[PDB]
Design a protein around this nucleic acid. Structure first.
Lengths: 494, 52
RNA sequence: UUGACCUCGGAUCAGGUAGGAGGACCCGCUGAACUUAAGCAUAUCAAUAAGCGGAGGAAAAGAAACCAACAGGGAUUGCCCUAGUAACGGCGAGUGAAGCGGCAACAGCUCAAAUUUGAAAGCUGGCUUCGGCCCGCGUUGUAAUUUGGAGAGGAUGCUUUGGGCGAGGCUCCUUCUGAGUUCCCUGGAACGGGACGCCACAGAGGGUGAGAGCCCCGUAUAGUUGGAAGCCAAGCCUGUGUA
RNA sequence: GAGACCGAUAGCGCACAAGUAGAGUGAUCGAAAGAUGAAAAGCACUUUGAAAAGAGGGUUAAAUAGCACGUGAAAUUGUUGA
RNA sequence: GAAGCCAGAGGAAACUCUGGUGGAGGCUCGCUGACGUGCAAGAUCGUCAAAUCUGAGCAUGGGGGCGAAAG
RNA sequence: UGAGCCCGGGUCGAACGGCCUCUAGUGCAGAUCUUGGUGGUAGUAGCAAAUACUUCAAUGAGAACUUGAAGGACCGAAGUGGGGAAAGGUUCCAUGUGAACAGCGGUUGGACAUGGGUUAGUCGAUCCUAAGCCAUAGGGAAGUUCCGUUUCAAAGGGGCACUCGUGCCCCGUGUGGCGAAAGGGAAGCCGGUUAAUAUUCCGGCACCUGGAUGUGGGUUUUGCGCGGCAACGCAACUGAACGCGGAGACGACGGCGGGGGCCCCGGGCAGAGUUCUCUUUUCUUCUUAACGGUCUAUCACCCUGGAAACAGUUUGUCUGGAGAUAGGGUUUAAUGGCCGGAAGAGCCCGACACUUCUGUCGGGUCCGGUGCGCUCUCGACGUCCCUUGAAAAUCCGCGGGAGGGAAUAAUUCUCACGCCAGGUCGUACUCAUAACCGCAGCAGGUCCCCAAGGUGAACAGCCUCUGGUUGAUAGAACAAUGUAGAUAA
RNA sequence: AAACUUUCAACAACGGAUCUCUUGGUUCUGGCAUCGAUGAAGAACGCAGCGAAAUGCGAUAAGUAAUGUGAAUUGCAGAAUUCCGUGAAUCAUCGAAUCUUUGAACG
């Protein structure tokens, strides 16, 4: 019988601390972070951190040993070492003055600043992370959120301007794929931006794109982590677009006319050729779009659901079907300002989003300019019994106590027995019926409370602790709901 | 003992409760494999071992 | 702040090398005594044995800071005489060469010392589709030219070229190649005796029941079959650059 | 490949399961020991004997060749005869 | 069988005796030579060996003369 | 003449001779010659001590030394007994043989031949270091190698970090290995079983170490639990780096006390033995493991209180205002008591069975006493010494506060239960007047464990219980002598 | 007279001399140049149907692959080989392999 030591088996050689992993790999912390981000390696919670490492605190991060083995066997680490040696060589050449050799060594070093592409090829990494196009589609949500954010963000040292341009390119190509295949489904406006949900091969992809302003950047936000994420998501989205285009039959990449890009076409700078219910909403229509309106979102929506003839002001850029506002061959015009051509339907953009939302042409006279717009709903929360729904009415979603209380409000808008007997010796129908109803309901509530107290006493210690936690959570939920229907009540009385 | 158990299970389909091993004076190893109660040593010896 | 160069380190870094055995002969180091003779001592044994280090099919030496004194010879090595001569030794015990001369065998060369300076022209890697791509070493000197019975540089006019296949051949293993088991006697068994023959560029040797050229393997000369690797080579393709 | 060599006390210590058996703590020391017969044809069967073996019988040219085996001296010994 | 302790009796005390309790000892039982000193014609005093038994592991010092040793 | 030469008879089987030259390892009575073989002495000397053997039967061709029974002797717990260390190596065990060995024989053997036999998480090795030694850094040496062991060695670790700038921090040496089958050390007991193995096989009942993980329980919206004056108590009741401590870890002797075994004495049950006579008689059985639960305490420590008219107290000593006596409590526990184990076991006795595998059923296994007795362990006290009494592996606690949270739960809780696993090597036998060494199967040497009783003053002598011998070449004649040396008779 | 001692002869013993033989030694001569970290020389343990030693080999273990020959090995046992054939053999050659523990011996 071997006398095995205490901490030499089990979780000890199952998990490894972050410092131990970094020392084993012989990496700088930035390099370890980049490799973990690219490979999707994440910290784990062991069952007992003391058994894993007797000197481990509550703030110690633990990493899987087999994941550290994958990192050790990754070829990208040898690539990193080669790049570091090369950078030392350029430093040597520049410090001595050999400008031509420095330029050649940079050409070999393949920097994102000049190429516009990520410095490292991540083909095998993406293949092993998502061996299925379904998995690629399943993480496109975060991928697209990142690329739209950085396509709107300015340029940094970690994130080159050319790489911003390539992110914008990839976002536009993905938008064209959505336009052509009509796989965009639903949209929503928020105080955070615009949320788009599309359905690609049965997979729902949801992403957010900010409003076009100077997305303010404050605080200790580090763009190197974001830069690594952007690089990975750029390669991922490039392959997703390639596969989607070769599936539809179109040619990838679509031609990019730098000229029309210069006069600012964005989506209209791409011509997609081939290889040798949703699309009826606005097909037989003609849309013209003001200067104050978000051209990129609105154009994306209209081109996704049918409108093939969209025009706008010259300041928005090239690609307008017509720039003349007075043009008599127009159906609808979008404004949000506080020549009044008769043959025209003037609409506010909530009309466009509510039409895309409900798949039914919304009432324009209700959605008319200068009118207090009706509330905008969120096309994302499903009807969940037991939680507030803004669409169903109070009469079928109240609580019984508030119902009786509202009834008595609308109506107004032993001791008595003995005293009446002694004195005798010496509106009303409804109001009464309601007040006896109130006291009877209160009596029922008191009886229920008594039964609940009897049971909660008929629990044990930890069991009752868990039960009290459930009561606290449910009480907070119904309290928020009660606040909601109270505000409904005051809205509806006014 | 672990290899003896694995070989007995994989090849001749014998389940053993335990194994006791010794080294004979001539240099060969002798292993007593005590089997599970479900199986019968006589039946296994007659069928797979060819021993009467 | 950064970056060079110098020096010194790390790596289970990429690729390699050394140890041990054998030691008959060979190259070095170290190093006795017994014995012999002599008043004594040096000497002799012996620059040996024992011990230590280092190579090969040979080793080592080797192309004069030589021999010589002639009419001169001409790297090294080994044999013959030189010669028991010169020479050193109580001119004891004793020790003890070499030049010449005859033979065997023969073969000559490379660097450092000059500046390519009108062009580091050189070389190690490792990446290769093999065709060429980069990392470097190196100017504190890698190529080409020259090595003192020489040489360089200019001028001059004659004279010489370089690669790739390669039929075939030589060397060595292997296949095959003559003739009595004729008759009689002794004998357990003829391979012995007698008779009549045959082969022989083969009458060496061995086996077979006794001394066998002709029973068997073999043995002699010429070929003949297939294979092995080195070397040579008729011819045939090419050549190139003011080299 | 050979020899005016030696021929089992010779020739290498070793013609053989010889650097073996064996001795020494160890460095080391270190032997003895070849031959039936052409061919095992190495004696079937019978008898005595506990067996070992013996006697008939048989193999072979020979058992005056029986695996204590070619030939088989002397020392020494037994029987027989003088 | 010694120190130490207790009690009785004399001594002003220090002590002395007796009776004990105690169980420490370079204490017992079982089966000489070599020198040195000598202060004389040799006396006395000192020094040197004889150094728990035993299994398994381990280390060290070795001759002579010279010299104060250091060497 | 001679050294010699030739022929005959027998044996035998394969080569040999004469003549003239050539050649040499060429001629034997000696050398206390070499090797081998063989004699007389000579069937001679001789074949020891451990007192000692005898009768019947069986096996066998054969019996003093083969076996069974009986008789007489012996070792006498300081063994002629039961086991180990070292060393040996199959000698152990079953069957067969009797060519050689066992100074005689042999049916016997440690012989020879053929088969078999050694079962482990708990027993050792494996792990740790001790005295000591070896490599590495360096330095000598012509060199094989020597000095050197922490040295003028860049020698070893660990942590932190939103990826702000691909860094920055601390901590400490002799930086490794060897050296112990008696030192340190996690954990297994009882019964039964084979021809040969038993803490290993089977049955019953346990334990330890390591890992993974769930339930219950504890804490938590007062953040990390309560009680007691205190000694401290409990089912667990945050705790990083860093630091401290404990155990491992320890001398010899003396008497004293506690406890467990052994010895002794008595009663009771069952059986056996003597018995002319006597002996309410003599002997034997009457046992209870690991592990778990519960109860049990000297030392020590705490509270009240305050002592000389000094007290307490041991076999002895000593202790006490640096807190005694006294009163009241806390705490360290085993080989102690009770229960489970566990009577179902082991042992004793009786009855019934009869081709075999071999059985079935009844009863009992109880109660005391004592000690200048023996032995193991524990405890307080005293004395002495070379005077704080080896080291390391390993386990635990404490200080310090870095960090840390739970609303269809969190938990860095050493609590209960649940899950999994535990490899390698040795295991036979002897350990000696036959298994080791000594030239050997030698009256010799060789380390340790256990250790009954009677007579008896006795640790003097003698004799028995358990266990083990009857073995030293045997028969006939007589067998109790002689000499020498010691010894206070 | 027998026995005993001695002598001569025949047979039989003991012993291994002589003669004969020799898959051995010894000496001379000739051609050639070839150990080892790609793990040598040496030591150890295993491997055959029945083997102790010598020999061969290394868990692919008296051996595998390839080439050549052409019908065996042998003590016994059991299998072959169709022989008009990739094919026996304790066969030869030998260019591919297997190659346990140490040993310069190297975690």
């Amino acid at each position: 019988g071997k006398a095995k030591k205490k901490g030499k088996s089990g979780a000890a050689r199952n998990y490894m601390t972050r410092t131990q992993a970094v020392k084993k790999l012989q990496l700088s912390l930035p390099d370890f972070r980049k490799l973990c981000i690219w490979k999707g390696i994440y910290p784990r919670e062991p069952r007992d951190r003391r058994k894993v490492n007797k000197s481990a605190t509550a703030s110690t991060t633990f990493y899987y040993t087999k994941d550290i083995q994958y990192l050790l066997h990754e070829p990208l680490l040898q690539k990193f070492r080669e790049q570091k040696a090369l950078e030392k060589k350029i430093s040597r050449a520049l410090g001595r003055g050999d400008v031509s050799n420095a330029a050649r060594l940079e050409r070999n070093a393949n920097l994102p600043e000049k190429t516009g592409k990520p410095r490292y090829t991540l083909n095998h990494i993406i293949r092993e992370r998502y061996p299925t196009f379904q998995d690629a589609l399943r993480d496109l949500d975060d991928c697209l959120s990142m690329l739209f954010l950085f396509a709107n963000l300015p340029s940094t040292t970690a994130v080159p301007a050319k790489m911003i341009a390539r992110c914008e390119r990839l976002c536009h190509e993905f938008q064209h794929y959505l336009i052509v295949t009509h796989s965009l489904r639903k949209s929503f406006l928020s105080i955070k931006g615009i949320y788009y949900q599309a359905n690609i091969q049965g997979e729902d992809i949801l992403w957010l794109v900010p409003y076009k302003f100077n997305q303010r950047i404050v605080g200790d936000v580090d763009f190197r982590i974001m830069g690594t994420f952007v690089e990975f998501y750029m390669t991922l989205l490039g392959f997703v677009n390639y596969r989607l285009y070769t599936s539809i039959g179109l040619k990838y990449p679509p031609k990019f006319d730098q000229v029309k890009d210069d006069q600012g076409a964005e989506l209209a700078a791409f011509s997609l050729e081939g290889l040798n219910d949703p699309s009826q909403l606005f097909a037989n229509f003609t849309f013209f779009l003001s200067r104050e309106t978000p051209r990129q979102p609105l154009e994306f929506i209209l081109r996704a659901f049918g409108c093939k003839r969209i025009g706008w002001d010259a300041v928005l850029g090239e690609g307008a079907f017509t720039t003349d506002e007075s043009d008599p061959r127009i159906t609808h015009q979008i404004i949000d300002r506080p020549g009044r051509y008769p043959g025209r339907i003037y609409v506010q953009p909530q009309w466009v989003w509510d039409s895309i939302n409900d798949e039914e042409l919304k009432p324009p006279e209700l959605y008319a300019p200068g009118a207090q717009l009706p509330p905008h709903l969120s096309p994302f929360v499903k009807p969940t019994q037991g939680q507030y729904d803004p669409t169903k009415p109070l009469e079928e979603q109240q609580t019984e106590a508030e119902a009786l209380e509202a009834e008595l409000e609308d109506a107004q808008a032993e001791a008595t027995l003995e005293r009446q007997r002694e004195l005798e010796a010496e509106l009303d129908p409804k109001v009464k019926a309601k007040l006896e109803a109130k006291k009877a309901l209160e009596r029922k509530k008191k009886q229920e409370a008594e039964e609940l107290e009897r049971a909660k006493g008929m629990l044990s210690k930890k069991k009752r602790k868990l039960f009290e936690q459930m009561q606290y959570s449910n009480a907070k939920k119904n309290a928020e709901d009660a606040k909601l229907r109270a505000k409904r009540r005051r809205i509806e009385k006014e | 003992k672990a290899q003896i158990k694995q070989a007995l299970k994989k090849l001749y389909d014998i389940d053993t409760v335990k194994i006791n091993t010794l080294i004979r004076p001539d240099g060969t190893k002798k292993a007593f494999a005590r089997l599970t109660p479900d199986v019968d040593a006589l039946d296994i010896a007659a069928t797979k071992l060819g021993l009467v």
